[PDB]
């Protein structure tokens, strides 16, 4: 028996949101907890840095708020998929932010069931690209030329 009851989707300031977001009251729809929401948020936006994040607080009947969001969109999962971990005491040698075709694809497929896109090449570039702009770079995608 699955049937989400409430889901708050909006954009909150990373490393700046406070227990008084543009929703607040419109958010307390699971148990009435604004801090826990921003508390954890700030935690993520506090460990990474400042920015904006499209929250997707999915409040399930069982007062369950499921939503993974921290750095800008694409980063939502391209980060861990790329390598944006922490400053690291030693230089990350490789270029910070590196994903692979297979990664951007699997990351796009679910992000392109058939909305505006359709084929993978399209979404694929949308992802491998989104990262490209995010300073990230495609590690896989073996430049296939004379093959």
Backbone as a ProteinNet text record, in pm:
[ID]
protein_1_A
[PRIMARY]
XXXXXXXXXXXXXXXXXXXXXXXXXXXXXXXXXXXXXXXXXXXXXXXXXXXXXXXXXXXXXXXXXXXXXXXXXXXXXXXXXXXXXXXXXXXXXXXXXXXXXXXXXXXXXXXXXXXXXXXXXXXXXXXXXXXXXXXXXXXXXXXXXXX
[TERTIARY]
86.1	0	88.4	122.8	208.9	128.6	145.4	70	115.2	223.7	272.6	153.1	162.4	49.2	87.5	212.7	255.3	402.6	437.5	579.4	613.1	703.3	739	858.6	837	947.7	975.5	1091.2	1121.9	1273.4	1315.8	1461.8	1500	1588.8	1629.6	1777.7	1816.8	1958.6	2052.2	2152.4	2247	2339.7	2352.1	2440.5	2380.7	2253.7	2190.1	2043.7	1986.1	1843.6	1827.2	1716.1	1692.9	1553.9	1528.8	1396.5	1278.5	1300.8	1189.5	1198.2	1193.4	1201	1074.8	1079.5	962.2	840.9	860	747.5	716.9	815.9	794.6	656.2	559.1	422.2	372.4	393.8	347.6	433.8	535	622.8	578.5	550.4	506.7	383.2	400.6	284.1	310.8	417.9	449.3	445.1	507.7	507.2	523	539.3	555.3	699	794.9	937.1	1010.3	1032.2	1102.7	1253.8	1297	1443.3	1499.6	1460.9	1512.4	1530.4	1432.6	1441.9	1564	1561.4	1676.6	1798.4	1778.3	1894.4	1978	1920.3	1995.7	2043.1	1954.8	1995.4	2124.3	2115.5	2237.8	2353.5	2329.3	2437.7	2503.2	2425.8	2483.4	2538.3	2457	2503.3	2612.8	2628.9	2734.1	2863.7	2852.8	2975.2	3027.4	2939.4	2984.2	3017	2917	2942.3	2809.2	2812.7	2686	2638	2509.9	2457.8	2305.1	2247.3	2099.1	2067	1957.1	1926	1774.2	1730.8	1585.8	1535.1	1495.8	1447.8	1331.8	1320	1208.2	1159.2	1127.7	1082.2	958.4	977	860.5	800.3	696.2	633.3	539	574.3	486.9	385.8	269.7	165.8	232.6	314	382.2	472.6	424.4	507.8	653.1	676.2	815.8	860.1	960.5	1008.8	1135.2	1121.7	1241	1286.4	1411	1461.7	1613.3	1686.8	1834.5	1873.8	1920.6	1959	2061.8	2162.6	2267	2327.6	2407.7	2469.8	2376.1	2395.9	2310.6	2259.1	2156.7	2095.5	2197.3	2222.7	2319	2404.6	2462.1	2546.9	2466.5	2338	2253.6	2309.3	2353.9	2410.9	2537.5	2554.4	2677.6	2797.2	2777.9	2890.8	2948.7	2877.2	2928.3	2968.3	2889.8	2923.9	3051.4	3072.6	3195	3313.3	3318.5	3431	3440.3	3346.4	3349.5	3335	3438.7	3430.7	3463.1	3582.5	3619.7	3754.4	3787.7	3917.6	4028.1	4020.7	4125.9	4259.7	4331.2	4462.4	4560	4550.5	4642.6	4567.3	4636.6	4571.6	4497.8	4378.2	4301	4362.5	4490	4556.6	4457.6	4383.3	4285.3	4212.3	4137.2	4063.5	3939.2	3919.3	3800	3673.3	3588.8	3463.6	3491.5	3475.5	3500.5	3395.5	3315.5	3211.4	3240.1	3167.2	3193.6	3063.2	3071.3	2948.9	2849.7	2884.7	2792.7	2728.9	2806.4	2750.6	2652.4	2695.2	2601.2	2477.8	2496.9	2380.2	2286.1	2328.2	2240.5	2181.9	2255.8	2205.7	2101.7	2110.6	2013.1	1890.8	1911.5	1796.7	1683.6	1710.1	1603.4	1561	1644.5	1609.4	1557.8	1512.3	1461.4	1365.4	1281.8	1185.2	1114.5	1099.1	1031.4	980.9	1021.1	973.3	996.9	1095.2	1123.9	1219	1301.3	1403	1342.3	1417.8	1368	1485.2	1575.1	1692.1	1796.8	1893.2	1997.5	2094.9	2149.4	2245.4	2201.1	2075	2026.3	2050.9	1976	1996.3	2143.6	2201.8	2345.3	2423.9	2419.8	2493.6	2441.4	2312.3	2255.6	2326.9	2356.7	2426.6	2577.1	2641.6	2788.1	2815.7	2725.7	2742.8	2719.8	2602.7	2576	2702.7	2761.5	2886.6	2996.1	3010	3114.1	3111.4	2995.8	2985.8	3020.9	2973.4	3004.2	3153.8	3235.1	3381.9	3411.1	3312.4	3332.8	3372.7	3426.6	3467.3	3431.4	3398.5	3363	3490.7	3499.2	3621.5	3607.4	3492.2	3471.6	3453.4	3340.9	3317.3	3448.5	3499.7	3627.1	3621.3	3684.9	3683.1	3691.9	3579.7	3581.6	3601.4	3714	3739.4	3752.9	3870.4	3889.9	3847	3811.8	3768.8	3866.1
-121.7	0	124.9	174.5	295.9	412.1	530.3	647.2	774.4	833	957.2	1044.9	1115.2	1202.3	1349.1	1381.8	1523.4	1528.2	1617.9	1628.4	1775.2	1831.2	1974.2	1985	2042.6	2059.2	2208.6	2253.7	2398.9	2420.7	2544.2	2573.5	2646.3	2589.8	2656.6	2695.5	2799.6	2845.5	2747	2699.5	2604.4	2682.2	2638.8	2711	2848.2	2853.4	2984.6	2963.4	2852.5	2827.3	2832.4	2882.9	2891.7	2836.3	2803.7	2748.8	2835	2922.3	3007.4	3017.3	2905.5	2904.3	2961.1	2983.2	3036.8	2943.9	2828.6	2732.4	2714.2	2678.6	2658.8	2597.7	2678.2	2626.7	2530.5	2562.7	2472.2	2345.7	2341.4	2221	2129.8	2186.2	2102.8	2021.7	1920.5	1837.4	1691.1	1664.6	1524	1509.7	1599.6	1590.7	1730.7	1830.1	1968.8	1989	1969.1	1987.3	2070	2195.9	2281.7	2273.5	2271.8	2264.4	2134.6	2021.7	1892.4	1905.5	1960.8	1979.4	2065.8	2189.5	2278.6	2233.8	2188.4	2141.9	2047.2	1937.7	1842.3	1916.5	1988.5	2064.6	2140.1	2242.8	2319.4	2221.3	2111.7	2011.7	1982.2	1939.7	1910.2	2039.4	2141.1	2270.2	2329.6	2277.4	2330.3	2252.3	2127.6	2046.1	2073.7	2100	2128	2276.7	2359.5	2505.6	2578.8	2698.5	2774.2	2755.3	2765.6	2747.8	2736.6	2679.4	2663.6	2515.6	2467.8	2323.2	2301.3	2244.2	2216.4	2107	2142.5	2038.7	1961	1837.5	1752.6	1671.9	1740.5	1672.3	1587.2	1459.3	1370.9	1320	1383.1	1337.7	1220.7	1102.7	984.7	971	918.4	901.8	873.6	771.7	739.3	855.9	976.5	1094.2	1066.7	1023.6	994.9	1099	1175.8	1279.1	1228	1176.5	1124.1	1225.1	1264.8	1362.4	1377.8	1347.1	1363.3	1485.7	1588.9	1711.3	1790.6	1842	1919.1	2023.8	1981	2076.8	2093.4	2195.5	2220.4	2090.9	2101.5	1983.6	1875.9	1860	1755.4	1700.2	1786.1	1738.6	1646.1	1669	1585.3	1443.3	1388.4	1251.3	1246.9	1342.3	1344.1	1365.3	1436.9	1459.9	1325	1251.3	1118.5	1038.3	1045.4	970.4	1029	1156.7	1219.5	1194.1	1263.6	1244.2	1365.5	1455.6	1576.1	1533.1	1478.4	1434.1	1551.8	1556.4	1668.6	1727	1843.3	1906.1	1800.2	1705.2	1599.6	1663	1602.7	1660	1653.1	1550.8	1539	1579	1632.4	1673.9	1558	1581.8	1473.2	1442.5	1466.7	1439.3	1461.2	1359.9	1374.5	1508.3	1545.7	1675	1657.8	1745.6	1733.9	1726.3	1630.1	1617.7	1537.3	1407.8	1324.2	1213.3	1212.7	1107.1	1025.3	919.6	837.1	815.6	810.7	790.3	701.9	578.5	487.3	561.9	637.9	712	819.2	909.2	1015	948.7	844.6	776.2	727.1	630.5	579.6	698.7	805.9	926.2	997.7	982.7	1050.2	960.7	838.8	746.2	776.7	766.6	794.5	941.3	1024.7	1169	1198.6	1098.6	1122.7	1010.9	965.2	857.6	884.1	1008.7	1042.9	1186.9	1258.6	1398.7	1480.2	1566.3	1646.9	1567.3	1491.9	1411.4	1285.3	1178.6	1051.7	954.3	982.5	892.6	921.4	834.8	857.6	965.9	951.1	1053.2	1192.4	1223.3	1357.3	1374.2	1305.5	1318	1292.5	1191.9	1162.8	1293.8	1364.8	1493.8	1587.7	1591.4	1680.4	1652.7	1528.6	1495.2	1515.3	1430	1447.5	1596.5	1664.7	1811.2	1883.8	1871.1	1939	1932.4	1816.3	1803.1	1885.3	1871.9	1950.6	2094.4	2154.9	2294.6	2296.5	2200	2195.5	2170.8	2216.7	2194.3	2044.8	1962.4	1815.4	1781.5	1664.8	1627.3	1480.9	1447.5	1306.3	1222.4	1123.4	1038.6	924.9	863.9	752	808.2	782.7	834.6	831.3	713.7	698.2	762.9	875.6	943.7	839	795.4	693.4	762.6	741.4	805.9	698.2	682.3	578.8	442.5	436.2	306.3	196.2
0	0	0	-115.9	-122.5	-181.7	-128.8	-182	-109.9	-153	-86.8	-48.6	61.1	103.5	83.7	100.5	82.5	41.6	-46.3	-90	-116.1	-40.1	-60.9	-155.6	-270.9	-368.9	-385.7	-345.7	-358.2	-359.6	-363.1	-364.1	-235.6	-158.5	-32	-40.6	28.9	27.7	98.1	29.7	93.8	187.5	309.9	405.7	436.4	466.4	496.9	536.4	498.9	534.6	686.5	732.6	879.4	911	1035.2	1076.1	1028.8	934.3	883.8	731.1	663	514.3	448.7	320.2	246.2	257.5	315.7	331	479.7	556.8	702.9	728.5	765	792.5	684.2	559.7	450.8	450	532.5	536.8	651.4	765.7	881.4	842.2	761.7	719.9	755.7	825.2	862.9	1015.2	1086.1	1234.8	1294.7	1211.8	1264.1	1312.6	1226.5	1267.5	1161.6	1188	1088.6	1110.8	1233.9	1261.2	1202.9	1256.5	1202.9	1051.7	985.7	838.3	806.7	845.8	817.1	898	1018.6	1099.4	1013.3	971.6	885.9	761	697.1	576	607.5	687.5	723.3	741.6	808.4	828.4	693.3	597.1	462.9	402.3	395.5	337.6	426.4	544.8	635.8	613.3	576.2	552.1	410.9	318.1	178.7	164.5	152	137.8	119.1	67.3	46.9	-97.2	-120.3	-258.9	-255.7	-357.8	-361.7	-383.1	-331	-349.5	-365.9	-477.1	-498.3	-403.8	-284.6	-189.2	-249.5	-211.3	-259.7	-139.8	-33.4	91	62.2	40.2	11.1	142.5	189.9	317.2	288.6	332.2	307.3	421.3	392.4	498.1	632.7	639.4	767.9	807.9	795.2	832	793.8	672.9	629.7	527	559	463.4	394	274.9	202.7	97.1	101.5	1	14.3	-89	-81.6	-163.9	-99.6	-174.8	-93.8	-158.8	-85.8	-179.5	-273.1	-369	-489.3	-568.9	-688	-752.6	-833.9	-901.1	-942.3	-1070.2	-1118.7	-1003.9	-924.8	-811.6	-719.3	-707.4	-616.7	-608.2	-717.4	-712	-797.6	-885.5	-968.8	-876.1	-768.1	-673.6	-631.6	-550.8	-507.4	-631.2	-735.3	-859.3	-919.7	-902.9	-959.5	-866.1	-755.9	-660.3	-567.8	-577.5	-490.1	-344	-286.7	-144.6	-52.4	0	90.8	47.7	96.5	58.7	58.7	148	152.9	191.2	282	323.2	205.6	125.3	8.7	-118.9	-216.4	-343.8	-412	-458.6	-525.6	-662.4	-677.9	-808.7	-923.5	-958.9	-1070	-1056.9	-1156.7	-1150	-1062.6	-968.3	-879.7	-965.1	-939.5	-1019.2	-1146.4	-1140.6	-1261.4	-1268.5	-1371.6	-1385	-1510.5	-1532.5	-1653.3	-1730	-1860.1	-1942.7	-1866.8	-1843.7	-1770.2	-1652.8	-1580.5	-1464	-1511.6	-1596	-1642.9	-1704.9	-1781.7	-1844.1	-1734	-1656.7	-1547.6	-1471.3	-1462.9	-1390.7	-1477.1	-1606.2	-1696.1	-1716.2	-1758.1	-1780.7	-1681.6	-1554.1	-1453.2	-1462.1	-1517.4	-1528.9	-1669.9	-1740.6	-1878.7	-1920.4	-1831.1	-1865	-1998.3	-2033.7	-2162.1	-2154.2	-2052.9	-2036.2	-2163.7	-2163.5	-2285.1	-2371.7	-2306.4	-2376.2	-2436.9	-2437.5	-2496.4	-2511.5	-2601.8	-2621.7	-2513.9	-2498.6	-2394.7	-2441.9	-2559.5	-2610.1	-2564.5	-2578.1	-2535.1	-2385.2	-2303.5	-2156.5	-2124.2	-2183.7	-2156.8	-2158.7	-2268.3	-2275.8	-2167.1	-2147.7	-2042.5	-1910.2	-1882.8	-1755.8	-1773.9	-1849.1	-1870.3	-1887.5	-1952.1	-1973.2	-1840.7	-1784	-1654.2	-1569.3	-1559.2	-1480	-1548	-1677.4	-1749.2	-1697.7	-1695.6	-1645.3	-1496.4	-1422.4	-1276.7	-1257.3	-1348.4	-1334.8	-1348.7	-1325.9	-1338	-1481.8	-1504.1	-1642.5	-1668.5	-1790.4	-1821.8	-1824.3	-1740	-1737	-1838.4	-1844	-1940.2	-2081.1	-2142.1	-2279.6	-2358.2	-2382.7	-2457.9	-2596.5	-2612.9	-2745.4	-2856.5	-2907.2	-3015.6	-3150.6	-3213	-3344.8	-3452.5	-3507.3	-3612.7	-3558.5	-3433	-3374	-3416.6
[MASK]
+++++++++++++++++++++++++++++++++++++++++++++++++++++++++++++++++++++++++++++++++++++++++++++++++++++++++++++++++++++++++++++++++++++++++++++++++++

